Design a protein around this motif. Structure first.
Motif, short mmCIF file in Angstrom:
data_model
loop_
_atom_site.label_atom_id
_atom_site.label_comp_id
_atom_site.label_asym_id
_atom_site.label_seq_id
_atom_site.Cartn_x
_atom_site.Cartn_y
_atom_site.Cartn_z
N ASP A 208 -3.90 5.62 -6.85
CA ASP A 208 -4.15 5.82 -5.43
C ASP A 208 -5.86 4.93 -5.20
O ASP A 208 -5.65 4.66 -4.27
CB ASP A 208 -4.52 6.38 -4.61
N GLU A 209 -6.97 5.31 -6.48
CA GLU A 209 -7.65 5.15 -6.04
C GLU A 209 -7.73 3.84 -6.61
O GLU A 209 -8.82 3.36 -5.89
CB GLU A 209 -8.58 5.97 -7.30
N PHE A 210 -7.03 2.80 -7.19
CA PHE A 210 -6.43 1.21 -6.56
C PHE A 210 -6.80 1.08 -5.32
O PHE A 210 -7.34 0.03 -5.85
CB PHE A 210 -6.32 0.98 -7.76
N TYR A 211 -5.73 1.89 -4.90
CA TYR A 211 -6.14 1.54 -2.87
C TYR A 211 -7.21 1.46 -2.64
O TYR A 211 -7.19 0.68 -2.20
CB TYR A 211 -4.34 1.94 -2.43
N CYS A 212 -7.98 2.56 -2.95
CA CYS A 212 -9.41 2.51 -2.33
C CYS A 212 -9.60 1.90 -2.80
O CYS A 212 -10.86 1.35 -1.52
CB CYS A 212 -9.13 3.93 -2.60
N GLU B 11 0.58 -1.34 0.20
CA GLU B 11 -0.23 -0.08 0.11
C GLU B 11 0.90 0.95 -0.24
O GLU B 11 1.91 1.50 0.54
CB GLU B 11 -0.73 0.09 1.02
N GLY B 12 0.07 2.12 -1.26
CA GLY B 12 0.79 4.01 -0.61
C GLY B 12 2.37 3.89 -1.60
O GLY B 12 2.60 4.69 -1.52
N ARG B 13 2.28 2.51 -2.52
CA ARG B 13 3.17 1.92 -3.69
C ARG B 13 2.62 2.91 -4.81
O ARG B 13 1.80 2.87 -5.27
CB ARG B 13 3.82 1.34 -4.01
N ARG B 14 3.73 3.65 -5.85
CA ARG B 14 3.06 3.98 -7.25
C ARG B 14 3.96 3.45 -8.10
O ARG B 14 2.90 3.08 -9.51
CB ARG B 14 3.80 5.81 -6.74
N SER C 5 -9.68 -1.86 -4.22
CA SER C 5 -8.80 -2.67 -4.85
C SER C 5 -8.60 -4.60 -3.73
O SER C 5 -10.02 -5.36 -5.43
CB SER C 5 -7.83 -2.25 -4.23
N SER C 6 -8.83 -4.49 -2.62
CA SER C 6 -9.96 -5.73 -2.49
C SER C 6 -8.74 -6.92 -2.99
O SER C 6 -9.12 -8.31 -3.36
CB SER C 6 -11.35 -6.32 -2.18
N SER C 7 -7.55 -7.06 -3.05
CA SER C 7 -6.68 -7.99 -3.87
C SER C 7 -5.32 -7.60 -3.30
O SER C 7 -4.86 -5.99 -3.67
CB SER C 7 -7.31 -7.67 -6.04
N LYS C 8 -4.51 -8.45 -2.59
CA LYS C 8 -3.78 -8.57 -1.81
C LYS C 8 -2.20 -8.98 -3.07
O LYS C 8 -1.35 -8.41 -2.94
CB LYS C 8 -3.19 -9.80 -0.92
N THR C 9 -2.61 -8.92 -3.86
CA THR C 9 -1.87 -9.41 -5.25
C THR C 9 -2.11 -9.43 -6.91
O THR C 9 -3.14 -9.41 -7.11
CB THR C 9 -1.36 -10.93 -4.51
#
Lengths: 243, 53
Positions: free
Chosen positions: A138-142, A65-68, A144-148
Motif C-alpha cells: 500500500d505504501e506504493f500507492y501512497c 488502486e487497492g490491488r495487492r 506512486s504517482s504512476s498510473k502504469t
C-alpha cells in the motif's frame, strides 16, 4: 532466428543413424517417430534459452488502486481469451504463453523512474511471492504517482503446435534459434536420444560422450560471446556533488 | 511313407513360421518378454541373451 525443421531432421540423421529413430536397416529413411523427435527438440530449445538470454520481452500493466497481487498469466492479457472472473489488465506486449516468463528483470514506470525488485527495505520495493506474480504494498500507492508499469523479462519461445493432419508436411515448422545454438542443439538431442540403448563396451558410452561434447560447445559459445550481454555505465556525476 | 525333410521343414523364412528354429526362438522370446515385464530385465540384456543364444 528461424530454421526449417527439415534441415534439422536431415542433419540429425547423420548422428542418429545408429538407431531406430530415423533408419530402417535397409534403405535408411526417416520413420514416423517425428512426434517424439519434435517433443525432444522443444525441450532442447528451452534448455538453450535457459543457458543464454537470446531474447527479452515487454508488457504494460495498468494499475488499479487497492490491488495487492498482480499475476502475469495468459488469461489477463489483452487479445487472449477473456475469462469473465478476471479483468484484463495486461494491455500491451508480446503474446504470453505457458513458458514465457523465465525471470522478471526490470520495472519502469511511466515517469521514467526505475523501481526496485526483491531489494528489502528499499524505498519502493516490489516483491514476487510466486515467481509470476507481483505483490504491491500500500505504501506504493501512497507514493506512486504512476498510473502504469512496464515490465521486462527473459523469454523463451512458444513452440508451434503439431497436428495429426500436419503430419503431411512437418517441414514448414520453424524452430526459433540462431544457427550457432543449432550446432549445439544437435549434440543435446543426440545425447538424450542415445542414452538408453546399447550393451557393448564402446557402445554404452555414446550418451556420455555426447553430453561431454554438449558441455564443451556451450563453453565455446560463452567464450566467443555470441549472446546478448548488457554492461552498465552509470553516470554518478549528475546527482549533484561528484564534480 | 517317405516324407522328405527340407529346409522349409527346418525353418521357413518368415518370423512367425512353423519351423523348429522359429518356434524355439518364439518361446525364448516369450520367456524373456515375461521377465522384462516383471521388473527384472532392461531392454539390452534382452538383446544380448538372444544374440548369444
Amino acid at each position: 532466428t528461424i530454421q526449417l525443421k527439415q534441415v534439422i531432421d536431415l542433419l540429425a540423421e547423420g548422428e542418429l543413424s545408429n538407431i531406430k529413430y530415423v533408419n530402417i536397416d535397409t534403405g535408411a529413411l526417416v520413420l514416423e517417430r517425428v512426434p517424439s523427435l519434435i517433443r525432444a527438440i522443444n525441450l532442447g530449445v528451452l534448455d538453450l534459452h535457459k543457458r543464454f538470454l537470446l531474447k527479452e520481452g515487454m508488457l504494460k500493466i495498468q494499475l488499479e488502486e487497492g490491488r495487492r497481487l498482480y499475476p502475469l498469466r495468459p488469461a489477463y492479457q489483452v487479445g487472449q481469451k477473456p475469462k469473465p472472473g478476471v479483468p484484463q489488465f495486461i494491455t500491451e506486449g508480446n503474446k504470453l504463453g505457458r513458458q514465457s516468463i523465465l525471470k522478471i528483470e526490470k520495472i519502469i514506470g511511466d515517469n521514467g523512474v526505475e523501481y526496485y525488485l526483491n531489494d528489502t527495505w528499499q524505498p519502493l520495493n516490489i516483491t514476487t511471492p510466486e515467481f509470476d506474480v507481483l505483490e504491491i504494498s500500500d505504501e506504493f500507492y501512497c507514493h506512486s504517482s504512476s498510473k502504469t508499469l512496464e515490465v521486462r523479462y527473459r523469454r523463451a519461445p512458444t513452440p508451434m503446435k503439431i497436428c495429426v493432419d500436419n503430419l503431411d508436411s512437418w517441414g514448414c515448422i520453424d524452430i526459433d534459434l540462431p544457427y550457432t545454438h543449432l550446432q549445439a542443439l544437435l549434440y543435446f538431442v543426440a545425447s538424450r536420444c542415445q542414452t538408453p540403448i546399447g550393451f557393448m563396451e564402446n557402445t554404452a558410452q555414446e550418451g556420455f560422450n555426447f553430453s561431454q561434447k554438449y558441455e564443451a560447445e556451450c563453453a565455446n559459445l560463452d567464450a566467443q560471446n555470441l549472446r546478448i550481454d548488457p554492461v552498465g555505465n552509470q553516470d554518478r556525476f549528475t546527482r549533484g556533488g561528484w564534480v | 511313407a517317405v516324407e522328405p525333410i527340407t529346409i522349409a521343414d527346418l525353418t521357413e523364412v518368415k518370423l512367425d513360421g512353423k519351423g523348429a528354429l522359429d518356434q524355439l526362438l518364439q518361446v525364448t522370446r516369450l520367456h524373456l518378454a515375461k521377465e522384462h515385464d516383471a521388473g527384472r530385465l532392461k531392454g539390452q540384456e534382452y538383446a544380448a541373451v538372444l544374440t548369444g543364444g
